[PDB]
């Protein structure tokens, strides 16, 4: 157990602030420079901030300067990221990252990464999805449209987990309303359409919405 | 310093020798690291100082290069090496920047998609909106064109698409394209059509329906 564990993520409204924590364990935390690195949905990695092992030097990306403060409590083995004036382009997974130990004048690569905590900067309000059927017409396709929910995630299963093969539960797409939507589809033998029932089990924990929708052929 | 990686994607088979390329916009000496990342998890350090193998990393990974040109080689691709690979500089006075990444995916035989179209359900229409969903099931490779036609006229900007990761069993992709209109706009027009082109298909495949039918 040499690990880093971030916490403090969630939904934040634009202009508001948020403090991320990173709990380090299994190594001598106060001898390591530490970083935060972020990754927006569907994109690559972006460096955010560095703090010296003793807190005596700090540097930040231009994109976050004057809004983000990095700090550390070496006696509690925690790293912090204080983010103010959060905007839509701060929406990302945030990783706390340890620099690989080096002797010499130069710093090194990133050798230890936490699991990441998601920060979503949106003014949308929590909302359970509407679940609509995708009715089928030797293979037939059917599915469920899971539309207009916030925030992520939703889980979708078929027939209480007894139907898994042929299931494609697509990643959510962010609509211009600021709400998410996705479809879950499955292919089945068309001979099974009148004889087997097909129910999609949708669960949206952030809003306590749980839907079982029967998908019937037209 | 800006880092650029090529190709953005590449299709390889287990046992292939694969080389990924990374270029710095100005010299970074040998202050360059390579990372592996799979969906939903953190990056894993593979190579630092452009050529040094990180402690736990198997020997089929290696790296070389200095100045502005760098390469990551996997001597023999293995099933758990399919992932996105990032290079990253930490040159003196240059802060820390990453390449945009190279995704390594599983090569398999071409599979033309099966295509299904779905009119908006009665329930959705009752609620004020119309979504038309077009499904492309279990095709390879990823590249596909899905064009929506309404009243036999070509649309753009009113649809979005979503793609699965490579299927664990048969290495295919599946894709959805969703055309969203208001109830009123949808009831104005008559024919809704999904025209799919894919290199496995000798000619485009159109799935269409007539509103009401």
């Amino acid at each position: 157990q040499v690990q880093l564990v971030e916490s403090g993520g969630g939904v934040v409204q634009p202009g508001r602030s948020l403090r991320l924590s990173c709990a380090a364990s299994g190594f001598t935390f106060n001898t390591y420079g530490m970083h935060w690195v972020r990754q927006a949905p569907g994109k690559g990695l972006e460096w955010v901030a560095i703090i010296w092992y003793d807190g005596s030097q700090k540097y930040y990306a231009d994109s976050v300067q004057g809004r983000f403060t990095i700090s550390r409590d070496n006696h509690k083995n925690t790293l912090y990221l204080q983010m103010n004036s959060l905007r839509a382009e701060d929406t990302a997974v945030y990783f706390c990252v340890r620099v690989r130990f080096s002797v010499g004048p130069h710093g090194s690569a990133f050798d230890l990464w936490g699991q990441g905590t998601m920060v979503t900067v949106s003014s949308a309000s929590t909302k359970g999805p509407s679940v609509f059927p995708l009715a089928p017409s030797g293979t037939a396709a059917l599915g469920c449209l899971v539309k207009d929910y916030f925030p992520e995630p939703v889980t979708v299963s078929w027939n209480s987990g007894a139907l898994t093969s042929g299931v494609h539960t697509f990643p959510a797409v962010l609509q211009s309303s600021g709400l998410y939507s996705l479809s879950s589809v499955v292919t089945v033998p068309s001979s099974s359409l009148g004889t087997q029932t097909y129910i999609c089990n949708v669960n949206h924990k952030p809003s306590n919405t749980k839907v079982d929708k029967k998908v019937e052929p037209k | 310093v800006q880092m650029t990686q090529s190709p953005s994607t590449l299709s390889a088979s287990v046992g292939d020798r694969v080389t990924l390329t990374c270029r710095a916009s100005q010299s970074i000496s040998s202050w360059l690291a390579w990372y592996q990342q799979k969906p939903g998890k953190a990056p894993k350090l593979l190579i630092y100082d452009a050529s040094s193998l990180e402690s736990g990393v198997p020997s089929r990974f290696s790296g070389s290069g200095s100045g502005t040109e760098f390469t990551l080689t996997i001597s023999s691709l293995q099933p758990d090496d399919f992932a996105t690979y990032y290079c990253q500089q930490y040159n003196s006075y240059s802060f820390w920047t990453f390449g945009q990444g190279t995704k390594v995916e599983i090569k398999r035989t071409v599979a033309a998609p099966s295509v299904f179209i779905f009119p908006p359900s009665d329930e959705q229409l009752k609620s004020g909106t119309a979504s038309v969903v077009c499904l492309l099931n279990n095709f390879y490779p990823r590249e596909a064109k899905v064009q929506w036609k309404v009243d036999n006229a070509l649309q753009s900007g009113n649809s979005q698409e979503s793609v699965t990761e490579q299927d664990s069993k048969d290495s295919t992709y599946s894709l959805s394209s969703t055309l969203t209109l208001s109830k009123a706009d949808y009831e104005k027009h008559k024919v809704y059509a999904c025209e799919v082109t894919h290199q496995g298909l000798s000619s485009p495949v159109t799935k269409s329906f007539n509103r009401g039918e």
């Binding site: 390591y32 420079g33 030097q57 540097y59 620099v99 130069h106 710093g107 | 003196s92």
Partner: peptide, 9 residues
């Protein structure tokens, strides 16, 4: 190396 100088102890 300023920001890229060794940050460890």
């Amino acid at each position: 190396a300023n920001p890229n100088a060794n940050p460890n102890a």
